[PDB]
Design a protein around this ligand. Structure first.
Ligand SMILES: Nc1ncnc2c1ncn2[C@@H]1O[C@H](COP(=O)(O)OP(=O)(O)OP(=O)(O)O)[C@@H](O)[C@H]1O
Ligand SMILES: Nc1ncnc2c1ncn2[C@@H]1O[C@H](COP(=O)(O)OP(=O)(O)OP(=O)(O)O)[C@@H](O)[C@H]1O
Ligand SMILES: Nc1ncnc2c1ncn2[C@@H]1O[C@H](COP(=O)(O)OP(=O)(O)OP(=O)(O)O)[C@@H](O)[C@H]1O
Ligand SMILES: [Ca+2]
Ligand SMILES: [Ca+2]
Ligand SMILES: [Ca+2]
Ligand SMILES: [Ca+2]
Ligand SMILES: [Ca+2]
Ligand SMILES: [Ca+2]
Ligand SMILES: [Ca+2]
Ligand SMILES: [Ca+2]
Ligand SMILES: [Ca+2]
Ligand SMILES: [Ca+2]
Ligand SMILES: [Ca+2]
Ligand SMILES: [Ca+2]
Lengths: 124, 361, 361, 361, 124, 124
């Protein structure tokens, strides 16, 4: 889905990119807040790694908080697919659930994860 | 404007507006024609006029078989149920797994040329359900009124070569229950009474974890007995019938079918997929459709797949609470995303490229 | 060679040769193991060594529960009782109604792989009894030492979905009689004395046609009094105990059971069958097993079913004279028919298809 | 309002108000119908109209045998004797030991559906007597006009299986006395004269401690002679007849019965009970009913049970002074307790559950 | 039970087929004797009717004489089941007792039934 | 008889509970008076013992004074049965008569029994 501005700037550089699902839209999270997750929301996380020959590889994670509404978990899953398609399908997809995230995912956050109550209202 | 979401099934039509958390209209996908009245009817009036009409089901096992009746259904959906002007709303429609290219094309042609919608889209039902459960990879067990499908999906897309199908669903379960109750000296096979059997099935039936032991239990005590107040008066009670009816899904031979049961077709579907994604699939069996509503169904599937899979395999069966509408909800979510604006197939693109643009790459 | 017939029950083993009109060997299906002797014992010696052994019943309510003890029983049946070489004789075995497929398969496996029989067969007990009474359609009331079953049979075959079971039989009746006699200041609970109670039950007990009136009668005169010479000397006499003991079969609550009595389970079994064969069944109630030997039992059943069935229904209760051995006799007849030569399951077929061929179509 | 207490016996009806220490109305349970008058009569008028009516006893040996006459009796009890409106008072009725379930149910149905009582209750007569004597455990000897019962009771409840009954009571004793007096050249068998014999029995008869010695005594002197002034004039005197009449209770063969006497049925009743409560029972023999009023009766029973029981057993015979009304008094006390308000069976519960709720657990 | 020769030729044509139980075997009765029944024996009777379209329907009767031995009445009942199974279960089964046969059964014998004393010895 | 308030609080703790029959009703006796019995009255006594595993056992005694009226001795006996039924029948019943009480009963009163003349009037 080329023409969303978030997709334009996705996977252009090594590092982490974190977006939060907000009323059927993907809204970027402030870089200084990478690591805090509202348990009532859903997020899409793109990890981009640069190889020694300058090529980039991608790993997509969609994190679901135990209190998010179906519309958000649904959108997060649809957004991950779309973002992967936009990256010519080269990304590897990972579903991450609160309290049970994969070692790799947990490894992206040096000072651990912060699950805070609440979040944005459902788009229904 | 606001997009419309239409999920067409063998037995029920689920329609409404994208953005909504549930379908505004749910009626029988039935068309009635004069078999003296001269009008043709759709859904619940069609059933009320049984005596003067010939009823037909436009959709057979998930596939549209009669396009002229299908047109009536869609007409009744827009103007009567939703009360909207088609030409006014982009419409997302759903299609069954393995739907022939010709059907997809003909659906597109009718929407544009007959209903004049400004834009439309066609999505696979199983995929919309998986999305509804917050997943991009897994194997969906979709079971409704006319057909049952095993659909393995990976990173957003179905694997066609691995899809399994079984022409056994709710209607078959209601006929069977109706058969065993008639044997005991009752009668329905009419309307309010055929309605009664379906209702007994949806309220009293459940799937046994171990069929022989349940049978032994039902034969040894009245602990599994249940009663149902008929609309007339008498109270009929059932025991082993409660789980014998749904057992058919695991043992098709109960009604004369030589096919494998749903646990076996789910397993075969997984074994037909690339060895490297099978763990994804075993850990993500998502149930969808009205015939997956039986209490006990998830535990039984879990047990049977376990008996077939490798001993170390993590097997999980997911049963969403509103799985009767998963397909519609998933479509509602999809058609609502900000990124979906450029995914519709517009009249322009149609008038310029033809029904063929309804296929993908 | 000559085929062997083996009827395994919760309390007694009936074994012999096909073609014979009765079982050559009848002994307790009990296994004794050292609880200093180091041998394990079967049947009557096992009982004689009570003090140095731990007794177990391999069959519980008609179903084999301990295969290692069951093997001892069969070993003792061939070599000690019948004195034959298993490998030499085709053997027909009997199985209880609703026996799990796994048991049937395991029975087959042991016979072939452990006893090396050349051929075998497994028949449902109730069906063998009906055949013994010259009938292909009817509902059998089989009641032995450990379990009671209602088995409706049509044109040669049982209707599994209609079978009823009640975990109440002879042993329960002996315990109860033993309980009421102990209350009056006696004691057995030993061996020759527990033997004495069973003997009092089988010689003096009977079923009352009308329980209240019999009770009133026993309370008003000594006309129903009976005496029994104990092996020591004293003469104990019983009155209402005579019919109170068997009454439990019609009123399970006499011993603490919440279940319906045998007249009620017989009726429910019939009402679970196709309306069009019920007349066949009401007119053909066949009694089978040792616990159906009580004088008065048939008249009482006739009366109670009559009170439950339609007023115009022809109700008949059949009580064969040797119904203690009906099951064995029926098997003896079956294994003897000239047409049965091709019905056995041979070692070849086993070694080639596995225990699974023991099931039917 | 105030509850009503109604004790219905083979010969007399005892009715009144709960809270009272004695029955307000005591009349013959007799119904007279025209055998020219066209009315039917109850109790003492029925007897006065002997010549134009056919008399019947609704209760036979403690059990209601004719429900239409029983209805008349109850009608006469409410409106004529007690002068009350049934619909206005909860009523406790009494029933004989071993009363068939059907009778209890039919009694309940008539009270509610015919008399429209707001609530009712059914109690066993023997139990009400034991309660009247300040006891929860013991064996009651209840003897009235039509039947004699042995009722062992433990911690408030009767032990049905141990109850003994003897169809020999007062009416049999009056007929016998009437027979031996007629032999000596007298005549009654009429009304005021049959009335005379009963009166001679209740005033002059007594039970001998040792029958042979009393006979020897009566044969050797006039010390046991007694005279009775007939209503006409002549004075008839009796000697051995005085104790020969009641002796029949201990020796039924005096009137042609093959049954055991009351001392023997009391003993057999005790021996039918659990060895561990027999001491409770021997120490608590409570007499109840009009036929236990004979002077000497308690001493004789004490002696005869002693000759049958173990030498170390403490044997006690209790003879309450108003034992002619023990049953009614016990009911009066029961229906009066503050805890009894929630024990009644109300019309609601009846109209909602049926006559069947009159049974217990 | 296909391989008994009696089963091979059972129900091949319209008419009556009568067999008598003889020491655990089914022995055909001489057609000229159809109607005579030894009261001490048991028999199996197959009535085959041809419909106007050439298809055949079956009715199986097993007749028990008041003096037959248990082995015979038992075999007759087992044979009826087997014969019915061989006919793909299409036959309707009927138990017939001496002196109380059904109207239908009695209707197969124009000149009535002849119950004669005796019969073959028990197979026990 | 669940709904009497005396039954509600009967047998809830180890110890003695003493009630006196008063005009067809059970009236609790003041704990400081346990041991004094009016010879013209009737009483119900519940002894509750706690076992080492915390379970409770019951022994019911109904005491009859030599001058009580029939209505009271009758009620005392009926109340004992009812109280036993309320305790699921687990109580053992004992009839106690003035001047002849059982050793066990006498054992419940350290400083012996005090029989005092008089009492409450009959409910008749
Ligand atoms: N609670 C329930 N328990 C059992 N069955 C139910 C329940 N609710 C609905 N059903 C059944 O599930 C079936 C319906 O599902 P759905 O609405 O899923 O079917 P479709 O989409 O109409 O059919 P299909 O998917 O087969 O093309 C109905 O036939 C109905 O009888
Ligand atoms: N004449 C009789 N009267 C009453 N009971 C009898 C009589 N003869 C035998 N029995 C009883 O019937 C019971 C036995 O039957 P059978 O031999 O029918 O039992 P099984 O086959 O051993 O048991 P099950 O069928 O319950 O598995 C015994 O427990 C025995 O006490
Ligand atoms: N003082 C007495 N001495 C002897 N007999 C008496 C005396 N007083 C009454 N009776 C007799 O006792 C009998 C009555 O008792 P009750 O009133 O006890 O009988 P029921 O309740 O009428 O009868 P049943 O209990 O037999 O059904 C009468 O037949 C009467 O003759
Ligand atoms: Ca949210
Ligand atoms: Ca990818
Ligand atoms: Ca569907
Ligand atoms: Ca595992
Ligand atoms: Ca058996
Ligand atoms: Ca009838
Ligand atoms: Ca009485
Ligand atoms: Ca003594
Ligand atoms: Ca013969
Ligand atoms: Ca058939
Ligand atoms: Ca007092
Ligand atoms: Ca108790």
């Amino acid at each position: 889905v080329v023409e969303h501005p978030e997709f334009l700037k996705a996977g252009k550089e090594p590092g982490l990119q974190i977006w939060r699902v907000e009323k059927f839209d993907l809204v970027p999270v402030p870089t200084n807040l990478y690591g805090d997750f509202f348990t009532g929301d859903a997020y899409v996380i793109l990890k981009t790694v640069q190889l020694r020959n300058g090529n980039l590889q991608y790993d997509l994670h969609y994190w679901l908080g135990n209190e998010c509404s179906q519309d958000e978990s649904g959108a997060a899953a649809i957004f991950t697919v779309q973002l992967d398609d936009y990256l010519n399908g080269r990304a590897v997809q990972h579903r991450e659930v609160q309290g049970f995230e994969s070692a790799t995912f947990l490894g992206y956050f040096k000072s651990g994860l912060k699950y805070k109550k609440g979040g944005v209202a459902s788009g229904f | 404007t606001t997009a419309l979401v239409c999920d067409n099934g063998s037995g029920l039509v689920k329609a409404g507006f994208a953005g909504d958390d549930a379908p505004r209209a749910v009626f029988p996908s039935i068309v009635g024609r004069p078999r003296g009245q001269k009008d043709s009817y759709v859904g619940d009036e069609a059933q009320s006029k049984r005596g003067i009409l010939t009823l037909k089901y436009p959709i057979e096992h998930g596939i549209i078989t009669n396009w002229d009746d299908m047109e009536k259904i869609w007409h009744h959906t827009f103007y009567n149920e939703l009360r909207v002007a088609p030409e006014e709303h982009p419409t997302l429609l759903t299609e069954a797994p393995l739907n022939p290219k010709a059907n997809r094309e003909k659906m597109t042609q009718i929407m544009f040329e007959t209903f004049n919608v400004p834009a439309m889209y066609v999505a696979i039902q199983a995929v919309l359900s998986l999305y509804a459960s917050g997943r991009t990879t897994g194997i969906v067990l979709d079971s409704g009124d006319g057909v049952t499908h095993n659909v393995p999906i990976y990173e957003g897309y179905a694997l066609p070569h691995a899809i399994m199908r079984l022409d056994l669903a709710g209607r078959d379960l209601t006929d069977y229950l109706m058969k065993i109750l008639t044997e005991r000296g009752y009668s329905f096979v009419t309307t309010a009474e055929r309605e009664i059997v379906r209702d007994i099935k949806e309220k009293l039936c459940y799937v046994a974890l171990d069929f022989e032991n349940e049978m032994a239990t039902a034969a040894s005590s009245s602990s599994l007995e249940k009663s149902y107040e008929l609309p007339d008066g008498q109270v009929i009670t059932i025991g082993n019938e409660r789980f014998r009816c749904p057992e058919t899904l695991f043992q098709p031979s109960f009604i004369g079918m030589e096919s494998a049961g749903i646990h076996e077709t789910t397993y075969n579907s997984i074994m037909k997929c690339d060895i490297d994604i099978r763990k994804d699939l075993y850990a993500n069996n998502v149930m969808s459709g009205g015939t997956t509503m039986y209490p006990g169904i998830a535990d039984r599937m879990q047990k049977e797949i376990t008996a077939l899979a490798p001993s170390t395999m993590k097997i999980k069966i997911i049963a969403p609470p509103e799985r009767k509408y998963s397909v519609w909800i998933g479509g509602s979510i999809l058609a609502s995303l900000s990124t979906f604006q450029q995914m519709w197939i517009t009249k322009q693109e149609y008038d310029e490229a033809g029904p063929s643009i309804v296929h993908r790459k």
